[PDB]
Design a protein around this ligand. Structure first.
Ligand SMILES: *C(=O)c1cc(-c2cc(-c3ncc(CN4CCN(C(C)C)CC4)o3)c3c[nH]nc3c2)cnc1OC
Length: 862
């Protein structure tokens, strides 16, 4: 019908690529992915349209619980019924559950409307006012994030009784429309010609090619002869590799590098030896090369789409048989793997136990762990990664006996599985195994590691893969996973190397949720408008005064195309947050280089909670900032699970397009720089500039409120000192540190991390030390209490050291200039002192903390 056509065009504008372009490729791998993933995604949609009303609440509005609650006191709550202005305020216990609260609200309604109610508390859920958030399930009220948030800021929770019939109606409204192993000859290729090559004509062209299984070489690299620099070089050379065709692992990649010599690299191109159908590739192949910025094994195996500019390499994959050759099926693999030999003294078992309880190892150590592989599966299953790295992947017989053990290997913990997703484990069965051990991930853990999982999609060799199906299935089952999966993919559509894979996943997702595609379209339209408004602000700020640019901005925003496009949307930063009425008079732009837009919203239905802001930033790369903020959030989750709340501010930061993204406004907060200006006729005007920040906290927090504000400052200070030390956040100054009116300190503008290469020391600023000490010169009772907070925070993070290392290792796929090699992850190994005992790492940390105090005292002596 006309609808199928309309949806296809809406998908096209949403993903930023015409769907006709996918068909124009005439690519069988692309075509098969589209068919298969459309089928799988529409199955999910059908499953969803029949969920029960509580199950549909778990899809659309997943519970936001406190980290402590995963796996008393008096409380005032305001409850109202859907479509009623009359509300009931009643005292409840933080230990009470939503059903008791609901049954209580029903009894009030029954007395108020003088009628015993047929409705039972079991037929309801409590919505947070003007938000896509709900309180339901068997959990005390204090376990919910919203109730927890209300208790700390003193404020009263405002809840609406929503009946099942209204929830079911939402579900209804949102429905989709109605053999190789005998081939002993050495692997070889033919390097035919080069096309569109650009280099210095004094030099000569060389083609270096190597066979890789992930990062490791399957044999030594081979180099073609030197041929004089020109546009179309003609080699005609049969390059031979020291590896039998029978020994090529399934995931073997042929990597090429084209360079000029008198060392000047021109381009690179990679390709999988076996196709997506496991057939050994033969024939002629034109490799549209990528411009180099050594060989590039981790780089994409798909050719450069820019066929006009790109230099091309013509190669010939020889026909090794008169019939097609496929990689042997698992049944053939396991049949060969079933046969081997298992058997050395207790002293040699202790040698194996010492190495497996540790990490690089010698060649004699490799020989021991390989022969003892059966004992590895039997007594140390979590050491699979060590055994997988000692497996000789260039020996088809060794690969077979490894796979035999892996196929009966027990499911490993989530920490172990995340390590197996790294590019240093390129086997498909290994990747299928890791995905299997990751199905046990809770939606909360999945959401926490979604950014890393999206990045390891760039390591994939084929379109249809276990990770894609896993991410699609989880996104289709949880709307928040879906929302964030879509944005992570959409923000990378300008990267030609991922635009095809990422575009195809988003299309598949869209087939899974027509309604959500429309909701995301509403977000893309606002972001389109924001870009146009920001471009304008940029040029105006360069010509006239700030009040003049601000007034022109407001007039442009007051156009109906802008009022419609910027209003009534779900926030890309948090689909729970609804951005209702754009507050034009409160909108402005900041004075920094990119003139970022400061956009405010209000919602009568949400009250004070509806007053939310977004920062539109265009011109900067926000990926590193988002990663740093997600890591600080992880620390906060890890500190909270051990009962330590350091009052952190991990505000939203989401890239949405090319050098484009949104940042969450933290209201009632100013930078340390703005507070320290010490302006005249203010409630905080100081006698000593050292008093300015404490005077400001006093003006915001009168009487008893001050002690709480200083404690919030101390807690947040300790968390950020540890966060910035562990992560190597340098270039810290008064204009990238902010303070909230509650006393909470937080950092912004995370341009540089991991010491990028200098060792970032522990930092203690005197201005903050002065606040922690309550404005007293000596207050060791409060100072040492802060030092205990730092040590406790540091100690907790170390216990989770391997979780940070694994996540940051997966993030290497993002290609962030500050996260691109082994030395970057070494910085975290050093900061977290993982090569030490807790006692030794605590002395190490104390020696670093005492050194920061002596630094801070250069300002105390002044
Ligand atoms: C890029 O621009 C960027 C921005 C943030 C980020 C900054 C701020 C922030 N910076 C200064 C101020 C304080 N100021 C108070 C007064 N109001 C006006 C409207 C009266 C303007 C702001 O705020 C910020 C505040 N809340 N969230 C924020 C984020 C972080 N990272 C950036 O680039 C990576």
């Amino acid at each position: 019908d006309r609808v199928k056509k309309l949806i296809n065009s809406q998908i096209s504008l949403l993903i930023g690529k015409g769907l006709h372009e996918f068909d124009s490729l005439r690519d069988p791998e692309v075509n098969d992915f589209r068919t298969k993933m459309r089928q799988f995604c529409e199955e999910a949609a059908a499953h969803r349209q029949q969920l029960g009303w509580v199950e549909w609440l778990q899809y659309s509005f997943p519970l936001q619980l406190e980290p402590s609650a995963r796996g008393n006191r008096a409380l005032l709550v305001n409850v109202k019924f859907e479509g009623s202005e009359e509300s009931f305020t009643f005292q409840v216990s933080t230990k009470d559950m939503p059903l008791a609260l609901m049954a209580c609200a029903l009894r009030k309604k029954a007395t108020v409307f003088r009628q015993p109610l047929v409705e039972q508390p079991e037929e309801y859920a409590l919505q947070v006012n003007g938000r896509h958030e709900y309180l339901y399930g068997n959990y005390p009220l204090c376990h919910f994030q919203y109730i927890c948030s209300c208790l700390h800021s003193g404020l009263t929770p405002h809840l609406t009784m929503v009946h099942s019939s209204s929830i079911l109606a939402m579900r209804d409204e949102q429905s989709n429309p109605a053999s190789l192993w005998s081939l002993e000859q050495p692997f070889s290729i033919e390097l035919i010609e080069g096309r569109k090559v650009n280099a210095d004509e004094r030099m000569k062209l060389v083609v270096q090619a190597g066979l890789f299984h992930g990062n490791e070489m399957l044999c030594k690299t081979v180099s073609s002869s030197e041929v004089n620099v020109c546009s179309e070089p003609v080699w005609k050379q049969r390059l031979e590799f020291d590896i039998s065709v029978c020994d090529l692992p399934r995931m073997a990649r042929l990597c090429f590098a084209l360079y000029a010599v008198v060392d000047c690299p021109i381009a690179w191109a990679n390709l999988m030896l076996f196709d997506y159908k496991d057939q050994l590739k033969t024939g002629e192949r034109c490799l549209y090369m990528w411009p180099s910025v050594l060989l590039n094994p981790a780089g994409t195996v798909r050719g450069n789409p820019n066929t006009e500019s790109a230099a091309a390499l013509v190669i010939y994959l020889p026909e090794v048989a008169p019939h097609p050759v496929y990689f042997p099926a698992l049944e053939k693999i396991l049949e060969l793997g079933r046969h081997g030999e298992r058997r050395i003294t207790e002293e040699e078992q202790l040698q194996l136990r010492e190495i497996l309880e540790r990490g690089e190892l010698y060649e004699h150590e490799k020989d021991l762990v390989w022969k003892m592989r059966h004992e590895v599966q039997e007594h140390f299953p979590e050491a699979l990664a060590r055994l997988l790295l000692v497996t000789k992947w260039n020996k088809h017989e060794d690969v077979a006996q490894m796979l035999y053990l892996l196929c009966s290997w027990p499911e490993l913990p989530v920490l172990s599985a995340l390590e197996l997703l790294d590019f240093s484990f390129p086997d498909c069965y290994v990747g299928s195994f890791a995905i299997k051990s990751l199905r046990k991930l809770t939606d909360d853990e999945l959401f926490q590691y979604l950014l890393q999982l999206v990045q390891v999609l760039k390591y994939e060799s084929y379109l249809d893969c276990e990770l894609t199906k896993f991410l699609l299935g989880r996104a289709l089952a949880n709307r928040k996973i879906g929302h964030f999966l879509f944005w992570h993919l959409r923000s990378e559509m300008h990267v030609p190397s991922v635009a095809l894979r990422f575009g195809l996943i988003m299309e598949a997702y869209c087939r899974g949720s027509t309604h959500h595609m429309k909701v995301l379209m509403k977000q893309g339209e606002a972001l389109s408008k924001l870009k146009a408004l920001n471009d304008f602000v940029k040029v105006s700020s360069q010509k006239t005064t700030k009040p003049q640019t601000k007034e022109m901005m407001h007039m442009c925003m007051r156009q109906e195309t802008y009022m419609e496009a910027l209003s009534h949307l779900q926030s890309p930063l948090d689909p729970s947050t609804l951005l209702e009425e754009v507050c034009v008079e409160q909108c402005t732009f900041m004075d920094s280089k990119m003139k970022p837009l400061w956009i405010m919203y209000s919602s009568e239905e949400a009250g004070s909670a509806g007053n939310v802001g977004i920062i539109f930033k265009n011109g900067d790369d926000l990926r590193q900032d988002m990663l740093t903020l997600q890591m600080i959030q992880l620390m906060d989750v890890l500190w909270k699970q051990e009962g330590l709340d350091l009052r952190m501010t991990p505000y939203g930061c989401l890239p949405t397009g090319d050098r484009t993204g949104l940042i969450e406004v933290v209201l009632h907060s100013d930078t340390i720089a703005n507070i320290q200006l010490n302006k005249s006729n203010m409630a905080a005007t100081a006698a000593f500039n050292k008093d300015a920040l404490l005077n400001w906290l006093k003006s915001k927090n009168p009487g008893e409120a001050l002690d709480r504000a200083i404690e919030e400052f101390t807690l947040s200070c300790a968390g950020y000192c540890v966060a910035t030390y562990v992560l190597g956040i340098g270039d810290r100054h008064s204009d990238n540190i902010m303070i909230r009116e509650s006393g909470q300190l937080f950092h912004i503008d995370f341009g540089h991390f991991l010491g990028n290469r200098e060792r970032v020391p522990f930092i203690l600023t005197y201005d903050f030390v002065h606040v922690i000490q309550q404005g007293k010169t000596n207050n060791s009772e409060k100072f040492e209490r802060f030092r205990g907070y730092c040590e406790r925070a540091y100690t907790i993070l170390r216990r989770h050291g391997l979780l940070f290392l694994h996540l940051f290792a997966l993030m290497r796929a993002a290609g962030l200039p500050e996260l691109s090699c082994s030395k970057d992850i070494q910085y975290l190994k050093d900061s977290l002192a993982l090569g030490k005992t807790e006692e030794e790492a605590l002395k190490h940390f104390r020696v670093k903390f005492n050194e920061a105090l002596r630094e801070s005292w250069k300002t105390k002596v002044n």
